[PDB]
Design an enzyme around this catalytic site. Structure first.
Site, PDB file in Angstrom:
ATOM      1  N   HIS B  41      57.819  35.288  39.695  1.00 43.07           N
ATOM      2  CA  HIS B  41      56.754  36.074  40.349  1.00 43.07           C
ATOM      3  C   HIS B  41      56.819  36.927  41.492  1.00 43.07           C
ATOM      4  O   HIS B  41      55.932  37.564  41.909  1.00 43.07           O
ATOM      5  CB  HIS B  41      55.788  35.112  40.676  1.00 43.07           C
ATOM      6  N   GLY B 143      57.492  32.361  52.453  1.00 41.48           N
ATOM      7  CA  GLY B 143      58.847  32.805  52.575  1.00 41.48           C
ATOM      8  C   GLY B 143      59.899  32.057  51.955  1.00 41.48           C
ATOM      9  O   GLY B 143      60.991  32.350  51.700  1.00 41.48           O
ATOM     10  N   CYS B 145      59.908  30.669  48.939  1.00 39.48           N
ATOM     11  CA  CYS B 145      60.008  30.702  47.405  1.00 39.48           C
ATOM     12  C   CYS B 145      61.355  31.132  47.192  1.00 39.48           C
ATOM     13  O   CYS B 145      62.054  31.925  47.961  1.00 39.48           O
ATOM     14  CB  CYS B 145      59.153  31.738  46.764  1.00 39.48           C
TER      15      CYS B 145
HETATM   16  C1  LIG Z   1      50.001  28.635  48.002  1.00 41.24           C
HETATM   17  N1  LIG Z   1      50.442  29.514  47.224  1.00 41.24           N
HETATM   18  C2  LIG Z   1      51.655  29.590  46.610  1.00 41.24           C
HETATM   19  O1  LIG Z   1      52.318  28.565  46.796  1.00 41.24           O
HETATM   20  C3  LIG Z   1      52.301  30.847  46.081  1.00 41.24           C
HETATM   21  C4  LIG Z   1      53.609  31.290  46.623  1.00 41.24           C
HETATM   22  C5  LIG Z   1      53.673  31.403  48.066  1.00 41.24           C
HETATM   23  N2  LIG Z   1      54.769  31.907  48.688  1.00 41.24           N
HETATM   24  C6  LIG Z   1      55.523  31.114  49.528  1.00 41.24           C
HETATM   25  C7  LIG Z   1      55.359  29.633  49.940  1.00 41.24           C
HETATM   26  C8  LIG Z   1      56.048  28.688  49.278  1.00 41.24           C
HETATM   27  N3  LIG Z   1      55.971  27.452  49.538  1.00 41.24           N
HETATM   28  C9  LIG Z   1      55.110  26.938  50.323  1.00 41.24           C
HETATM   29  C10 LIG Z   1      54.119  27.759  50.936  1.00 41.24           C
HETATM   30  C11 LIG Z   1      53.040  27.640  51.664  1.00 41.24           C
HETATM   31  C12 LIG Z   1      52.106  28.310  52.188  1.00 41.24           C
HETATM   32  C13 LIG Z   1      52.343  29.517  51.926  1.00 41.24           C
HETATM   33  C14 LIG Z   1      53.395  30.153  51.278  1.00 41.24           C
HETATM   34  C15 LIG Z   1      54.287  29.432  50.570  1.00 41.24           C
HETATM   35  N4  LIG Z   1      56.667  31.736  49.904  1.00 41.24           N
HETATM   36  C16 LIG Z   1      56.490  33.291  49.363  1.00 41.24           C
HETATM   37  C17 LIG Z   1      57.332  34.098  49.147  1.00 41.24           C
HETATM   38  C18 LIG Z   1      57.037  35.274  48.844  1.00 41.24           C
HETATM   39  C19 LIG Z   1      55.854  35.234  47.842  1.00 41.24           C
HETATM   40  C20 LIG Z   1      54.834  34.376  48.051  1.00 41.24           C
HETATM   41  C21 LIG Z   1      53.668  34.747  47.590  1.00 41.24           C
HETATM   42  O2  LIG Z   1      52.658  34.138  47.848  1.00 41.24           O
HETATM   43  N5  LIG Z   1      53.555  35.215  46.345  1.00 41.24           N
HETATM   44  C22 LIG Z   1      52.466  35.547  45.734  1.00 41.24           C
HETATM   45  C23 LIG Z   1      52.433  37.029  44.708  1.00 41.24           C
HETATM   46  C24 LIG Z   1      51.751  34.725  44.804  1.00 41.24           C
HETATM   47  C25 LIG Z   1      50.407  34.449  44.817  1.00 41.24           C
HETATM   48  C26 LIG Z   1      49.900  33.282  43.953  1.00 41.24           C
HETATM   49  C27 LIG Z   1      50.575  32.462  42.850  1.00 41.24           C
HETATM   50  C28 LIG Z   1      50.026  31.319  42.336  1.00 41.24           C
HETATM   51  C29 LIG Z   1      50.949  30.472  41.586  1.00 41.24           C
HETATM   52  C30 LIG Z   1      52.537  30.995  41.738  1.00 41.24           C
HETATM   53  C31 LIG Z   1      52.825  31.733  42.699  1.00 41.24           C
HETATM   54  C32 LIG Z   1      52.149  32.626  43.208  1.00 41.24           C
HETATM   55  C33 LIG Z   1      52.652  33.818  43.982  1.00 41.24           C
HETATM   56  C34 LIG Z   1      55.346  33.118  48.767  1.00 41.24           C
END
Ligand SMILES: CNC(=O)CCCn1c(-c2cncc3ccccc23)nc2cccc(C(=O)N[C@@H](C)c3ccc4ccccc4c3)c21
Ligand SMILES: CNC(=O)CCCn1c(-c2cncc3ccccc23)nc2cccc(C(=O)N[C@@H](C)c3ccc4ccccc4c3)c21
Lengths: 306, 306
Positions: B41, B143, B145
């Site tokens: 993703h 961040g 992921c």
């Molecule tokens: C609640 N949201 C998600 O947990 C989706 C992923 C969120 N995130 C994280 C992350 C990973 N742990 C916990 C977190 C808690 C709060 C905010 C972010 C995180 N670290 C990231 C590093 C880079 C990008 C993202 C991100 O936000 N990417 C975008 C394009 C995204 C949006 C929706 C998604 C839905 C499903 C799967 C992946 C999805 C992905 C990241």
């Protein structure tokens, strides 16, 4: 989200762990540049520990009495000296993996990571705190002496603990990396015992602020307290006195949550009075005291080191 | 003596973490030989995630849309492809710190160490279990992921988890390193939720053995029970069923302590039915279920890796 007992990545310290053997004794040493640090009781037999005279025992040893082994490489000891309770072995090879490091002596209530090792090999890594009674509640088996504790804030390893011994109640005692013991303990087989321990009040408050940051408010109340009234109550539960320094250190967490420190004290007062009534806080059914204010900021916001 | 939540030493994995950027998104990748693994993703905008066509979205990208940074060094991407939910970026340079490793898929109730990273830089290490509901109770922020979970078997790293997302309750979902999700979760922005969880019965028993080894005995009793009777109780308290294989897996600990598993089961049945009555076990007021039998053996035997 989440909250975990989170240690530092241990690799910078792994590259430093060596095996030190003297006579029939083997334990761990810390190899930084061209010096290997280990507990001076490596030079003792069990029979020497009742009343050792380390000056006398050490003068009988030569360089080649010490076998230092890094991985499966042997290091040549070319010199030795004693600094307080640690032995410093000069070897003729500098550790090419020596990280940026410093030696720091910590205060009770401070936390650090422990890399438990046996025979110079890392076993695992966990978080600890220096208890108010100057012991640590470690997990250590025979062969673990010379394992170290450290922090790695901002890419520099701060060595603060070397393991020397387990006390009768199963907690642990050791030195800083200058060889001064934490607390009144000595590297001698005596009747020494841990004093009565107390709860690290400022850490409990920090952990309560962590719970708020992560979304739990159920333990707050409408009350406040004076610093002295809080201390008069908390010490009846064997909590450490909270000082104005502690209040100041909690300031940033107070600012982030909007909850004044003495208001959070009011909530702790009530929690001690009531317990949890079947609830948990950050997955714990007890009040947790091995996260410092700095630890909570380190984890509930996202900061990393290469 | 002592018992702590103990992670594996992380040094072998730290040398594999890199930063991966595509467009405005930054997350972590795993660099092994000349391939960098990260969540697929990474190629998606927030809009894309509403209903991604990964194959189509990936063909719109070229190799130089992926910026990979190993510390201060940029890696040149020379190829890209997906396996399931993992993106594979071939790079110009093999990672000279690549450990011996395998990709292994773990089962619910198994534990592993998480190396939480941000911007390709390791931040902390903690221990996690794969819950029966296929989530993990991690500690992760924006961040994180691409952070990975692993176990170590002597010199071989077994990578078993890559972090992809956080669910509404704040627990975490991810894939194995071949990109297969743990649990009924998908990498898209849609309504998703953790199912009701259960307690890992074999792990509680292992931890009760750890307590006995450490001198906590108050919950032992004269009684014994049968598998069927105990599984009626387990089912009532939302504990996983206990199988004959769980008993066999607990054989070593029943041998170290001399307490047969069905004898210990009688203790846990009573703890479930009557609670702990203000007492604690290994410093916990609840029944810990994130220590496997192997975790207990490893910590009360001093198993090392290097
Ligand atoms: C609640 N949201 C998600 O947990 C989706 C992923 C969120 N995130 C994280 C992350 C990973 N742990 C916990 C977190 C808690 C709060 C905010 C972010 C995180 N670290 C990231 C590093 C880079 C990008 C993202 C991100 O936000 N990417 C975008 C394009 C995204 C949006 C929706 C998604 C839905 C499903 C799967 C992946 C999805 C992905 C990241
Ligand atoms: C309870 N005993 C001590 O905690 C003393 C030190 C015990 N130990 C350990 C060790 C270190 N963590 C926890 C332990 C738990 C159980 C048994 C051993 C350990 N890993 C060792 C590695 C090499 C040598 C010894 C050892 O046994 N050395 C001998 C000469 C000794 C005897 C009495 C001592 C008294 C005071 C200080 C040091 C003393 C030292 C080691």
């Amino acid at each position: 989200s989440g909250f975990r007992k989170m240690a530092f990545p241990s690799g910078k310290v792994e590259g430093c762990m060596v095996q030190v053997t003297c006579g029939t004794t083997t334990l761990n040493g810390l190899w930084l540049d061209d010096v290997v640090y280990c507990p001076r009781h490596v030079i003792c037999t069990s029979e020497d520990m009742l009343n050792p005279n380390y000056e006398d025992l050490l003068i009988r040893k030569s360089n080649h009495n010490f076998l230092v082994q890094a991985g499966n490489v042997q290091l040549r000891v070319i010199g030795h000296s004693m600094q307080n309770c640690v032995l410093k072995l000069k070897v003729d090879t500098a550790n090419p993996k020596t990280p940026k490091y410093k030696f720091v002596r910590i205060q009770p209530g401070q936390t650090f990571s422990v890399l438990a090792c046996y025979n110079g090999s890392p076993s695992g890594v966990y978080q600890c705190a220096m208890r108010p009674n100057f012991t640590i509640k470690g997990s250590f088996l025979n062969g673990s002496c010379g394992s170290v504790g450290f922090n790695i804030d901002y890419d520099c390893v701060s060595f603060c603990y070397m393991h020397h011994m387990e006390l009768p109640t199963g907690v642990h005692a050791g030195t800083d990396l200058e060889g001064n013991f934490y607390g009144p303990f000595v590297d001698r087989q005596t009747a020494q015992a841990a004093g009565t321990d107390t709860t690290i009040t400022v850490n409990v408050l920090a952990w309560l602020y962590a719970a708020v940051i992560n979304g739990d408010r159920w333990f707050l109340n409408r009350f406040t307290t004076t610093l002295n009234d809080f201390n008069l109550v908390a010490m009846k539960y064997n909590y450490e006195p909270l000082t104005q320094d502690h209040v100041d250190i909690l300031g940033p967490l107070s600012a982030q949550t909007g909850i004044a420190v003495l208001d959070m004290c009011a909530s702790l007062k009530e929690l001690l009075q009531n317990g949890m009534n079947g609830r948990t806080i950050l997955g714990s059914a007890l009040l947790e005291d091995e996260f410092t204010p700095f630890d909570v900021v380190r984890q509930c916001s996202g900061v990393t080191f290469q």
